[PDB]
Design a protein around this ligand. Structure first.
Ligand SMILES: CN1C(=N)N[C@@]2(c3cc(F)ccc3F)CN(c3ncccc3-c3ccc(Cl)cc3)C[C@H]2C1=O
Ligand SMILES: *[C@@H]1O[C@H](CO)[C@@H](O[C@@H]2O[C@H](CO)[C@@H](O)[C@H](O)[C@H]2NC(C)=O)[C@H](O)[C@H]1NC(C)=O
Ligand SMILES: *[C@@H]1O[C@H](CO)[C@@H](O)[C@H](O)[C@H]1NC(C)=O
Ligand SMILES: *[C@@H]1O[C@H](CO)[C@@H](O)[C@H](O)[C@H]1NC(C)=O
Length: 405
């Protein structure tokens, strides 16, 4: 019966493409919506005075209205934390892409995290004021970013470490439970009541060791479709467990192999004989990569056709199906040959009435288990034991219209 603090998350894959929560900053409190991002480590948002910032769901944080704010000025041009001194202030600088940056300056102020059961944790945090935004930050609704990764020695103390340092009544575990609409962040553990009820093995958390000290990487040892490992050339692959990534990003070879079969399962018109015939004629020999379970490929194809599970291709050739039924499970191979089921209700996401593929090619050799891997499971960050746990779950769902103010 570990004590759990719970926080509502809002968002989705299609419209927001991230999930966010509300945090109170300053004195008196200014409530700010923040993207929940296990792939970064800062806490930042536009501040009043920014000359090139997007319009977000809240006004920029106003330093002049918070009595507890303290701008981090340079003392004879020297900043802590190896920061750069720019125009008298210690500079905040982040590359949202490989080469492009949000910039501003650092300040500290009080942060207050309140659970929806009215349980409060408060501390001071060194935060970034955006004074220049660009690209997607000019049209994102959320006001800032809440980085959930770990503190490094001699680095700026991060939100997650400060939260637990100031809540010793909690075990040092946080869980993210993403649903199709909204979700929940849990501090202090995971909630076994959310777990979906061989079958007893699927009701149990599967744990993987993190492969880096201060970032949430795990090693993936294979990825199966129709019983066939589609990355057999690679026998370990460090993937970032990243709630700030809309989609799941995989190596190019693996993507092309998977996408080949998803293309076969994507039929625009079930009454077009040429299109249907071409697919039903394919044999095990038709494939560059033969399948170990060709009969399961056939069952998927035949049931998609028989149930008229029509597919529409949208921008960039992404496949969208009318129904989840018929699409295959994928399996992620972890330690000790464990096959973690990755279901269509996770890797496909809701777009209008259809279910669209949420798997993409990596860029810059950055493979990512993103929100289409989080969806409909508890993802459990045990920072005490440096492990991440996974279990299928019925996550809380919160429409954005339920968000106060
Ligand atoms: C996958 N993915 C993330 N997981 N997160 C980022 C992000 C998530 C999101 F939901 C919306 C917009 C985004 F920029 C923030 N990124 C950073 N990557 C490394 C270090 C710092 C940042 C960063 C950049 C800008 C700010 Cl102000 C704060 C932090 C990289 C970018 C990204 O592509
Ligand atoms: C994951 O990490 C844990 C923790 O380091 C490993 O368990 C340790 O294993 C060593 C040697 O087997 C023992 O001396 C330690 O006492 C163990 N630690 C704990 C806390 O039990 C575990 O082996 C790792 N898992 C894999 C698959 O490598
Ligand atoms: C805050 O107040 C200071 C001094 O009163 C002023 O220099 C600064 O421009 C103010 N900031 C904004 C955003 O108005
Ligand atoms: C398809 O071919 C592969 C070749 O590696 C084989 O392993 C598999 O059993 C075959 N399945 C059939 C013929 O149904």
């Amino acid at each position: 019966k570990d004590l759990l603090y719970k926080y509502k998350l809002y968002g989705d894959i299609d419209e927001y493409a991230y999930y966010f929560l509300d945090i109170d900053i300053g004195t008196p409190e200014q409530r700010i919506s923040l993207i929940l991002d296990t792939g970064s480590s800062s806490l930042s948002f536009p501040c009043a005075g920014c000359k090139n910032c997007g319009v977000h769901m809240e006004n920029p944080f106003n330093l002049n209205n918070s009595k507890t704010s303290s701008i981090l000025y340079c003392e004879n041009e020297e900043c802590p934390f190896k920061l750069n001194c720019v125009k008298g202030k210690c500079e905040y600088m982040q590359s949202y892409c490989e080469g492009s940056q949000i910039s501003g300056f650092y300040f500290s102020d009080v942060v207050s995290v309140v659970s929806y059961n009215n349980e409060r944790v408060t501390f001071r945090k060194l935060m970034g004021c955006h004074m220049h935004e660009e690209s997607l930050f000019l049209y994102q609704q959320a006001t800032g970013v809440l980085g959930m990764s770990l503190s490094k020695p001699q680095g700026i103390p991060t939100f997650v470490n400060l939260l637990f340092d100031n809540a010793p009544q909690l075990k040092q575990v946080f869980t993210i439970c993403i649903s199709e609409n909204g979700g929940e962040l849990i501090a202090g553990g995971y909630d076994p009541a959310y777990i979906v009820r061989a079958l007893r093995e699927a009701e149990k958390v599967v744990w993987e060791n993190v492969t880096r000290k201060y970032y949430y990487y795990i090693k993936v040892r294979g990825l199966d479709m129709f019983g066939t490992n589609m990355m057999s050339s690679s026998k370990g692959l460090e993937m970032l467990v990243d709630s700030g990534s809309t989609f799941t990003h995989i190596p190019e070879d693996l993507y092309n192999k998977l996408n080949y079969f998803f293309d076969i399962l994507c039929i625009q018109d079930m009454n077009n004989a040429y299109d249907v015939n071409k697919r039903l004629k394919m044999t095990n020999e038709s494939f560059n990569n033969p399948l170990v379970q060709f009969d399961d490929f056939r069952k998927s194809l035949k049931s998609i056709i028989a149930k008229e599970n029509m597919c529409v291709k949208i921008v960039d050739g992404v496949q969208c199906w009318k129904y989840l039924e018929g699409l295959p499970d994928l399996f992620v191979t972890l330690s000790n040959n464990y096959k973690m089921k990755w279901q269509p209700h996770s890797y496909l996401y809701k777009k209008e009435s259809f279910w669209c593929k949420g798997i993409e090619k990596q860029v810059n050799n950055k493979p990512i288990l993103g929100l289409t891997f989080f969806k409909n499971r508890q993802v459990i960050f045990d920072i005490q034991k440096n492990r991440i746990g996974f279990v299928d779950a019925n996550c809380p769902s919160h429409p954005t219209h339920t968000r106060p103010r």
